[PDB]
Write a protein that binds this ligand. Structure first.
Ligand SMILES: O=S([O-])[O-]
Ligand SMILES: [Cs+]
Ligand SMILES: [Cs+]
Ligand SMILES: [Cs+]
Ligand SMILES: [Cs+]
Ligand SMILES: [Cs+]
Length: 138
């Protein structure tokens, strides 16, 4: 029972999805840009991730730039409401498994919450090796 909030256009999100598959399960895939979490779900994701609301904000996207969000003049709830009204602000990928929830940046963070071991060596799509055939992290 795994869920990934996935952006097919992001290498980090692609590598995370293939690592999930390499542990042997096909996750439920939520294209969050199109189908963002509800307010309640997003608050829960953030609490489970143990990160600040602002640490979930993606920089360098049009609403972050034009809404001035680099500056420290927003409460946590104002930032959650911006994220819901402009879903590209939600950084990615978020992964939920029975063991917990993480913002998988970098992608190998997901190894923390996958229940089953990678089934073989895993190399990221730019050739960065992540785990060898024996299962050791490199
Ligand atoms: O992938 S970075 O530009 O958020
Ligand atoms: Cs499985
Ligand atoms: Cs939803
Ligand atoms: Cs636009
Ligand atoms: Cs684990
Ligand atoms: Cs890269």
């Amino acid at each position: 029972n795994i869920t990934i909030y996935h952006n097919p256009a992001c290498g980090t999100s692609r590598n995370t999805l293939e690592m999930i598959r390499n542990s042997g399960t096909e996750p439920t895939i939520i294209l969050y840009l199109e189908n963002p979490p509800s307010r309640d779900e997003l608050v829960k994701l953030i609490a489970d991730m143990g990160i600040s609301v602002r640490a979930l904000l993606r920089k360098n996207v049009e609403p972050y730039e034009q809404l001035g969000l680099a500056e420290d003049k927003f409460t946590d709830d104002q930032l959650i409401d911006f994220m819901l009204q402009h879903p590209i602000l939600i950084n990615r990928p978020i992964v939920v498994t029975p063991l917990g929830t993480r913002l998988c940046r970098p992608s190998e963070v997901v190894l923390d919450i996958l229940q089953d071991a990678q089934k073989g060596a895993f190399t990221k799509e730019d050739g960065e090796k992540v785990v060898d055939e024996a299962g050791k992290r490199l």
